[PDB]
């Protein structure tokens, strides 16, 4: 409703770095809000793409940002009559970024890994890897829970069970309020998908440089399955956390699996032991139900609600024709211990190929009316296909069915304006939560400041 579309703030990165692919707000130890931006095709030292991370201080004028420096050098360790190897070329560092406390977690989902032993090998595969930084102190740590030292022949003999070689850990990520990092790994277990969790503190205290293969004890991974409904389901494409079981001492995980059960798509709510509490099945095959998930209480009863994007949903139109426009589903959490029901509301895109629902950002309470609000991205929407972000306001019965405000992309064609979103943080300290919108196609980020209601 009350985001200022006249006076924007633009931050920018190098050409072709995909600056703005991921973003998040970040508070330093003193509460000062900055913007952490991932740029997964930033050039490294060898004039090859490795990705990079930028930490943008808040300035109304925007501009350039200093980089958050990570080690881009390939690593080799000869230990245990084996050779360990990391390959950071085209790893996509900054394909996801998240901030918790004064710590930034930036992940390279396509970092490759191999182990050599005489003539054999583990195979060079994208296990993924996440980099952790405490910017004010300079502390650095890594977390790569899918690296193994098992040789290729063993997986073949054991029929590729518990095969974490293609995890792409850090594809999606989220941190609990208590400081537990949860990584989505859609390629884990031969493309079923897995989750990897470990406390940030234990990641820092168990990491030393040059070990490459190390145990972090509090770590907790999800499980392989023989059920064909999970095959090629990319469980962990998106991830989120929230309170869905009634017990405030437990945190519940929300997992998107957009190709679950032969591309029907699904979203599952779990406990911290990965035991399934509910499953939201997709409505239409190939619609990519679960591409994005968002958790926020929108109707002001204190119970977290769930939003699921299906950016390729094809709407039915006259003369038996379909039109891919995208769709967003709202699930209100019922009172006490009960299953999530049918959706309370369906929001459907209008522009063909607009991909409405590609991203869903909780905004907090934008208009300060007592109900939390959301922003939905259609990165190819709008009458010109340049991209659109639509704001929907919370209300006692859920969400409004029509948007309160639409943000047309200020960038040229192809910027993918809205492919990443982040709200619910007041960056200018004016008492109103603001919205940052990534446009990696233009290598830029746009900041929308919330203003008092007119």
């Amino acid at each position: 409703l009350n985001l200022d579309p006249v006076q924007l703030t633009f931050y920018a990165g190098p050409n072709g770095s995909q600056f703005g692919f991921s973003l998040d707000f970040h508070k330093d130890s003193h509460g000062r809000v900055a913007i952490v931006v991932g740029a997964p095709r930033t050039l490294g030292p060898s004039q090859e793409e490795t990705g990079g991370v930028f930490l943008c201080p808040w300035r109304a004028e925007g501009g350039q940002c200093p980089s958050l420096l990570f080690d881009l050098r390939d690593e080799t360790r000869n230990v245990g009559s084996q050779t360990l190897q990391t390959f950071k070329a085209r790893q996509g560092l900054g394909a996801s970024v998240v901030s918790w406390s004064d710590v930034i977690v930036a992940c390279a989902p396509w970092q490759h890994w191999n182990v050599l032993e005489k003539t054999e090998e583990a195979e060079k595969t994208p296990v993924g890897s996440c980099f952790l930084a405490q910017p004010e102190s300079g502390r650095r740590a890594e977390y790569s829970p899918c690296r193994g030292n098992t040789l290729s022949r063993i997986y073949v003999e054991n029929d590729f069970s518990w095969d974490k070689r293609y995890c792409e850990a850090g594809f999606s990520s989220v941190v609990t309020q208590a400081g537990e990092l949860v990584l989505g790994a859609p390629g884990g277990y031969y493309f079923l998908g897995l989750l990897a969790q470990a406390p940030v503190a234990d990641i820092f205290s168990s990491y030393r440089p040059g070990i490459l293969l190390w145990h972090v004890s509090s770590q907790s991974l999800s499980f392989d399955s023989s059920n064909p409904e999970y095959f090629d389901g990319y469980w962990g494409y998106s991830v989120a956390v929230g309170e869905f079981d009634g017990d405030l001492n437990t945190t519940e995980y929300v997992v998107g699996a957009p190709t679950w059960s032969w591309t029907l798509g699904a979203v599952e709510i779990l406990d911290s032991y990965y035991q399934r509490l509910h499953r939201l099945r997709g409505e239409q095959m190939a619609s990519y139900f679960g591409h994005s998930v968002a958790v926020t209480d929108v109707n002001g009863d204190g119970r977290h609600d769930l939003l699921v994007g299906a950016p390729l949903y094809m709407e039915s139109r006259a003369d038996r024709k379909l039109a891919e426009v995208g769709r967003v589903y709202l699930f209100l959490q019922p009172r006490g211990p009960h299953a999530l029901g049918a959706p309370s509301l369906l929001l459907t895109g209008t522009q063909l190929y607009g991909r409405f629902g590609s991203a869903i950002a909780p905004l907090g309470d934008l208009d300060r009316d007592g109900y939390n609000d959301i922003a939905v991205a259609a990165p190819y929407g709008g009458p010109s296909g340049r991209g659109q972000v639509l704001v929907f306001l919370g209300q006692s019965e859920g969400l409004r069915s029509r948007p309160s405000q639409v943000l047309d992309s200020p960038f040229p064609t192809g910027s993918a304006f809205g492919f990443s979103l982040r709200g619910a943080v007041d960056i200018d300290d004016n008492g109103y939560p603001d919205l940052i919108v990534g446009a990696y196609g233009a290598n830029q980020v746009a900041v929308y400041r919330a203003q008092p209601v007119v």
Partner: antibody
Amino acid sequence: EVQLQQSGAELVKPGASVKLSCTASGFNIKDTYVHWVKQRPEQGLEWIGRIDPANGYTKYDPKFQGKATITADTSSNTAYLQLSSLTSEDTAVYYCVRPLYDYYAMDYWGQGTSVTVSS
Amino acid sequence: DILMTQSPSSMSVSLGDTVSITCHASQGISSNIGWLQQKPGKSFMGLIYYGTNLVDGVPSRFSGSGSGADYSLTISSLDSEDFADYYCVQYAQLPYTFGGGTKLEIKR
């Protein structure tokens, strides 16, 4: 905490066979490698082998092939060292070891199991 | 196999001294070395892993250093409890091999 409670001291005759145990206290023995080390005053420390209790795959020093056999039961969270065709040279203290962080390290040690072969 | 020649066999020292044990390997091991402590009539305690990294709970007066095939364990300002045996162990190759041992004894 991480603790490795080994079995009590053993007293056997040459040619017999003994099975020592190493129980993981405070953690899952499936987490890391588990090694076995033999100690003698003159010969010092010698590495017998390791097992990965997650899958049961083992490694051995060729010196101990046929002599030693290492197994593990994830159920009881326990790892075992079997010694067969015992002789006087097998009279030693045996330790189970596991790393702290580094996959290939040797950081945590059991109290040791004393073995004595004699007729 | 890789031979681990640990020196010296023993040394008589006093409380507060700064002493240094060394360990020479028959070939390069790339800091894939650990340091161990065995208090008399008791089991083992890990001190160092990967050449320089302290095991959790070890005092800071312990430290490791070296590269290639020559490494050192140093104890700055000896404590009464620091009189025991110390062994190096390499894990650059299988089989793992140990050093002969070093006994720190009270000088008098």
